[model samples]
Target chain A: DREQLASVYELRMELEGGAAALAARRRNATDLAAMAEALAALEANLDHPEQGVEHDIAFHVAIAAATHNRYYQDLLQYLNLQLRLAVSTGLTAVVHQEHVAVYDAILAGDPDRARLAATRHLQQAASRLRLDLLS
Target chain B: VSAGLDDREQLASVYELRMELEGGAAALAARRRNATDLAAMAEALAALEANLDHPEQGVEHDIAFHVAIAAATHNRYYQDLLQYLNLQLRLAVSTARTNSRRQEGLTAVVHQEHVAVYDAILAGDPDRARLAATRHLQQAASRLRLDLLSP
Candidate 1:
C-alpha cells in the first residue's frame, strides 16, 4: 500500500532508502522533553568519570526514548548492550561532536536536522561496528 | 536507555522489528528474486504448512520461511539483520507461553497468510508482497499481544 528495490547493490541502496525515511521519522518525533534527561545525563557524566560511558549512551537512548516509541528505545538499548560489551577499543567517541550537533538540532526543534545529525551519529557507530565485526 | 520494559513492551519492540524487516525484505525480494529464491521460499512455506502441528518444527520452519524471504532480497545485511532480529522472537516462541495456535486450531488461517506473501512475490508485485507480509506480521503480533495480556 505504501511506497518505496533490485540488485544487491541496488537493493542495498533501496533498503538504505527505506532505512533513512524510518530513521528520519523517528528522529523528528524527538520527544522534546528527553532533551532535559540527556543534559542531566551529561551532568552525571562529569561526576562519576567512568559513568561517562553510560551517560554517553543514555544521551542516545534519551533521544530514542523521546520518540515515545518503545520500539526505538528497545532496539537502541539492545544495540548498546550488545555492542559495548563486545568491543572496547572500538566504538569510542566520535560521539561527542555528533552528540553536540544532535543536541543542538533537537533543542532547535528541527526534526529534519536532528534526524540528519543522529543518523550520521549512528552510521558512524555502525561503521565502527562493521570494522569490529571484521576484526 | 533500555529499561526493564514489561512483557507487553518487549512484545511490541519485537513486533516492530519483525514487521519492518520481514516486510521490507519482501518489498525488496519481490524485485530482485530469482528462481532459486522463489524455490527456497516455496520450500519454506511447504515445510511451514507441513509441520503446523509440530510446534518445534513449526517454529524452525517459520524461521526458515522468513530467512528464505530475507535471502531473496539479495542483500546479506538484510539477511543477517532479519535473522538477528527475528532470532529473539523465535526464542520467545520456543520458550514463552506455548503457541495457543495449536489449541486455537489456527493453522489454516496462518497458512493463508504465508500463501498471500508467496503469491504476491511470485506475481512480481512488490507493493502487494510488502503489504501481505505486513498484514500477516501485524496480525501475528496482535495474536502475541493477546498472549501477553491473557497470561
Candidate 2:
C-alpha cells in the first residue's frame, strides 16, 4: 500500500522493492523456530473460539516475519486482521492439516511453498465460503 | 506502501495492491478453497441476509464478514475492497432507485447471488467456487454500472 501511495512510479517501486529486498534477506533458525511455535499455538488452540482468527493470523504473520520484512509485516498486519475475522466467522473449521503442511514447508524454508500456502489458504477459503452460499 | 502515502498516492497504491492482492491472490486462492471454507462463508452470507433490515449496519458488517473468509484464505485483494467499494456502490444504488422511481431488484440480486456462491463455496468444490466467484463479481460490477447509469 505504501508503494501505491508513492509520489513517482519509482518511489512506489522503492516501497514495493523494500519488501522484495526484505524477503531476499535470509531467515535464520530462530525465525523458523518462531514460525513453528506460532503454528503449534494455532494447532493447540484450533478448537478454541476464544483464540479466534487472531491466533491464525498471528501465526502467519510470524511466518511472514520470518522473511524479516518489516514492510511485509505491515502488509500482513492489515490482511491478517481481516483473515482472522473470516476465520472467526463461518469458515470456523480449521483445516488443522493445512497447518501441518504449512509448518513443514516453512520449516523446510521454501519461499515458494510459503507463498503458495498463503495464497492457497485464501483461495480455498473463498471457494468454500462464497460458492455454495451464493449459489 | 501507502502508510507514508498521501491522498493521491494512497489511491494509486490501493489500486496497485488491488491488482496484486485482490485479482492475483483471488485467482490463485479461488483455485484452492475447501468445503469447510465454503460452509463458513455460507453461514456468514445467511447471517448477513438475516440482518439486512438494518441497512447501514448490514452493508458494512455483512461484507466484512464475507471478506474475512477471503483474507483468511489469503485473498487480501477482495478483502481490502470490502470497505469503500461497498459504500460507493450503495450510494449509487440509492441514487439510482430515486431516479428510476422504483425499487430496482438490487436487494434480490444481492441475496440470491450470495446464496449461489454460498452454496458453491460450501459444496467444497474449488473449481465450482472459482467460476462462481468470478461470475458473482461480474454480476456485481454490472449492477454497479447500472446503478451508476441510473438517471
Candidate 3:
C-alpha cells in the first residue's frame, strides 16, 4: 500500500508541478479569482476536517484548471481523489503555507519557481504522511 | 510563420508535459503490462507499418500505438490523459509530414524509435522503457523544432 501510495505521489509531483508551471504562464483573471476563492475557503475551513479536505481539493483543482490544459485538470483531479483516499485524516495546518508559496509563485508568473514550489509541497506532504518516495 | 512565437511556446509546453507523462506511463507499462496489453500494442504497431505510406492513417495508428502503451500502464489517468494529449497534438502530424518530405528516411527513424519503445516494454525493462519513451518525445519535439523548457 505504501508503494502504491508512493507511486501516486510521484505522479502527482510531476503532474502538479507541470500544471503549476503552465498555470503561471497561462492563467487569466478568472483563473486567479477561482484560485483565490478556493484558498479563502480552505483557510476558513481549516478547523473542519471534512470541509477542509474539500476546499483543499478545490484549490488544487483550481490550479490545474488555470493551466488551461484539459489533460492536466482531468489527471490531477483523479490523483487528488487517490491522495484523499490515502490520507483520509484531512490536511494539516502546515499545508496552508505550502499552498500559499505555490500560489505566490504562480501569481508572479515565475514558472521555475512555481514548479519548485509545487514539487516541494507534494514532497513535504508525502513526508508528513510518512511515505518513502521511490527514487 | 502562421504559428508564430506564442504558438511555438505553447507547443513546447505540451511536449514538455508529454515527455513526463508518456515516460512515466511507459515505465509503468514495463512493470504492469499484461498479455492483452502487449497484444494491443503489437496490433497497433502492425497497423502503423501497414499505413506507413498513408500518412493520414499512419497518424491515427501512431496515436493508437502510444495510447496502447498508456493503456498497458493500467492507470486510468495515463490512459485518458495520453489519449487526449495525442489527439490535442494531432497537428504534429502535419509537421511530421513536412519534415519527412524534407529529411529523407526520417519516417523510418521515427518508426524505429517506436520499435525501441515496444521492445523495452516487451522486455519488461522499466528503465529502458522510460528512457526510450522520453528520448522519442524529446526527439519528437526537436523534429517539430519546438524549444522545450529545461528540467
Candidate 4:
C-alpha cells in the first residue's frame, strides 16, 4: 500500500490496460462468461458474513482469469490484498453493481467497452481507497 | 530501483513492500499454511487479542502475527522481503495502533476476520485466502495512517 500510494495511477493504468487487452481479444469470452456467472452467484448472497469476502474475491479472480494474459493475471493476484481491502471495506454494493457493467462488456466481446468499464471500476476503487489523488 | 529514495521515500517504499510482501504472501500462506503455521497464527491471535486489553504489555506479537503469515506461506521469496528490511523500516508500522487495540468489540471482529483468513487458507481457497489477507493488510494500513490512506 505504501508503494501503491506512491504509484497510484500507474498501478491502476496497468491493471485497467491489461484487463482491456484481455477483453478485447474475444477468445476469452467463455472464460469471461464463467467469471460473470461466478459474480452473479455471489450477488445474491453479498451479506453472508462468511461467504461475503470469499465470493467477492472469487469474482475478481474469475475476471482476472478471463484476461488470458499472465501479466494481468499476476498483477491482479498480486493486488489481491488491496482488492480484498477495498471490497471488504463496505464497498460490496458498489463493486458488485459496477461488476455488472464489466461482466456485460467482457461477455459481449466489446473490448473497448470492457476496458472502459474495468477502468471505471478500478478508478472508482482508487477513489474509494483514497489513492486516486495521491502522488 | 530501490535507490534514490530519501528517508520519507524509503519509509514509503517500506509500506508498499509491506503491502505486497505481507498481503499476497499471506494469501499464499493461507493456501500453503501448515499445522505449525496454524499454531503460530493461533498463538499470535491469542497474543494479539490478549494485548487488546493491555497495550502497555507491548504488541510485538502484532508484528509477529504478520511475520507468521509470511512464514506460513513457506515462500522464501516472500520471507526475504521482511527479513531483508532494516529494523527501523520493518518496525515502522509496529508503532501504529490496531483496530483490535482501539475498539472493544472490534477485537472480536478482528478475531473473526483472522478466522476467515485461517479458514480460507486451510480450506485451500486461494481467492478467499488472498482476499482475507488483503482485508487484513488494508485494516492495518488504515490504522497505521501513514499518510498513504485518506483521513
Candidate 5:
C-alpha cells in the first residue's frame, strides 16, 4: 500500500508535468514528422501568405508532438490558433535565423535553449509578421 | 530557452499550426456542408461572442470552435494547426493585461476582433474571414507587447 501510494504520487507528478513534456512529444508520428518537413516548404513560397503560414504551423505542431504529449497536441493547437490570429500570417526573409536556431535546440534536447529560442522566436515571429509585440 | 511556461518551438509550432488550421478552415467553410458542422462552428462563435466581456473565457471557447471547424473538414492540416492555441491564449491575455491602460479603448477593439470574425464566417466570404482572423491576431501581437513590458 505504501508503495502504491508512492507510485500514485509519482504518477500524479508526472501527469502534472505532462503539459510541458507532452508538448514535447506527439502521437501521430507519420503526420507529425511530415509536418516538420513542411517548414521547408515555406521557403519556396515566401510570397505565399496562406501556404507559408500553414507550413509554419505544421512544423511547430510536429515539434509539440515530439514533446510526447498528444493531449498537449490540443494545447499546441490553441497556441497556434492564437498565434495565427495574433502573430504572423505569412513567411518572410529570416536573416535573423530564429527558425534554424530554435529547430536546432529542440533536436539537441536543450530545453533551456528551447525556451529561450522560443522567446527569440516569438520576437522574430512578431517581427516577420510585422507585429511590434516585443516592444 | 527554458522549456517553459512557453517554449519557442512550442510557441512557433502553435503559430505554425494555427495558420494552417484557421487558414484552411477559412477556405474550407465555403466548400463544406452538413448542418451539424456549420452549427457547431456557429455555436463556438456564439459562445465566443457571449464572452466578450471576459476575453479570457471567450479565448477558450473560441479555440475549441476554430478547431472544430478544422476537424469538420477532416483536414489534418487544420487539425495540426489548432494544436497551438493554448499558448496563443496566454499570449493574448498577457497582451491585454500589460496594455490595459492603452487597452481602455483597445480592449473593446480587441473584443470586437473576434466578433467581426464570427460575422465574416457567417457571411461565408473567405477573404473577410481571413481579414477578421488576421485582425484578431495582429491585435493580439500589439497587445502582447504590453504584456511583456508589464511588471
Candidate 6:
C-alpha cells in the first residue's frame, strides 16, 4: 500500500506539474476564472472536510482544463478517486498556500514557476502523509 | 493564426507529458516487474524489431512496447494514462512519419534506445530505467523537430 501511494505521488508530480506548465501557457480569462472559483469554493468549505476535498480536486481539474489538452484533463480526472482518498484527512493552511502558489504562477503566465510550484506542492503533500518518496 | 500557435504548443505539451508519464512508469516498472512482465516486454521488443522495416507495423509494436512497460509498473493510473496519451498522440500525428523518414542507421539507433530501456528494467535499476526512457523521448522529440520549451 505504501508503494502504491508512492507510485501515485510520483505520477501526480509529473502529470500535475506538466499540466501546470501547459496551463500557464494556454490559460485564458475563463480558465483563470474557473480556477479562482474552485479555490474560493475550497476556502469556503474548510470546515467541511468532505466538501473541501471536492473543491481541491476541482481546482486541479480546472488547471488540467486550462492546459487545453483533453488527455491531461481526462487522465487527471481518472485519478480523482485516489486523490480524493489521499486528501480526505483534511486541509491545512500550508496546503492552501501551496495551491495559491501554483495558482499565482499560472495566473502570471510563468510555466517554469508553475511547474515547480505544482511539483513542490505534491512533494509537500506526500510528506504530510508521512510517505517518504525521495529516492 | 492564433490557432496554429496553440496547436503547436499543445503538441509540445503532449510530448512533455509523455516524457514525464513514461519516465515515471519506467522507474516503477523497474522496481515492480515480475517474470510475467519481463516476458511481455521482451515479446513486444521482439515484435518491434521484426516490424522495423514496416513503419506502420513498427509504430503499432512501439506503442505496444510502451504500454507493456506501463502495465509492468503495476499501477493502474500509469497504465490508463499511458494508453490514453498514446491514443491521443496517434490522433494528433502519425508516428510513422518520423519512422519512415529515418535512414537505416538512424532507425537502428532508435532500436538500440529501446534495448537500453529494456535492459535497464530487466536489471531492476530504477534510476537507469527512468533515465533511459526520458532520453529516448527527448531524442524522439528532437528527431520529430518539435520545438519544446525548456522547463
Q: Number of the top candidate by DockQ?
A: 6
Model 3, range A1-135, lDDT digits (tens) per residue?
776666677778778877898899999999999899999998888888777777777788889888876545766788878787786543557888899999999999999899889989988877876843343
Q: Model 4 lDDT vs. the true structure? A: 0.60
Q: What DockQ do you compute for every candidate structure?
A: 0.16, 0.03, 0.17, 0.03, 0.03, 0.34
Give model 2's clash tally. Answer: 47
What value does the lDDT take at residue B101 in candidate 1?
A: 60
Give candidate 1's whole-model lDDT: 0.65
Worst 10 residues of 1 chain A by lDDT: A1-10
CA shift at A108, candidate 3, in angstroms? Answer: 22
Model 2 ranges off by over 4 Å: A1-25, A82-94, A131-135, B1-151
DockQ: the better of candidates 1 and 4 = 1
Question: Of the pair 2 and 3, which is ahead by lDDT?
Answer: 3
Instruction: Report the C-alpha displacement of residue A89, candidate 4, in angstroms.
Output: 47
Residues B1-151, candidate 6, lDDT per residue (tens digit)?
2235566566655676688788788988999999999998999999988876665577777888898999998888678868877765443234554544554356578899999999999999998998899899888866544322211
Off by over 4 Å in 4: A1-135, B1-14, B84-109, B146-151
User: For candidate 1, lDDT tens digit of each residue in A1-135?
Assistant: 001111222333333323333443554434544555666666545545576776776666566565555564565565546545545561233455666777777666565576567657666755654566567
In model 4, the number of clashes is 3
Displacement of residue B53 (Cα, Å) in model 4 is 0.5
Model 5 chain A TM-score equals: 0.59
Candidate 1 positional error at A73, Å: 5.1
Candidates 1 and 6: which is better by TM-score?
Answer: 6
Q: Pick by TM-score: which candidate is best? A: 6
Return the interface RMSD of model 2: 11.1
Chain A TM value for model 6 = 0.86
lDDT of 4 by residue, B1-151 (tens): 2123254344443444344445456556766788898888788777877765565443476567667777876655455555554233332222333443464454556667666776777786776876677677566545444433322
List, in order, the clash count of every candidate structure. 1, 47, 0, 3, 43, 0
Q: Give per-model CA RMSD.
A: 9.8, 16.1, 7.3, 17.4, 18.0, 6.6
Summarize candidate 2's per-residue lDDT along A12-113 as a digit string, tens digits: 222232222223245667766766676677667756856845666566555556555443456656644544444343344446665555566555656456
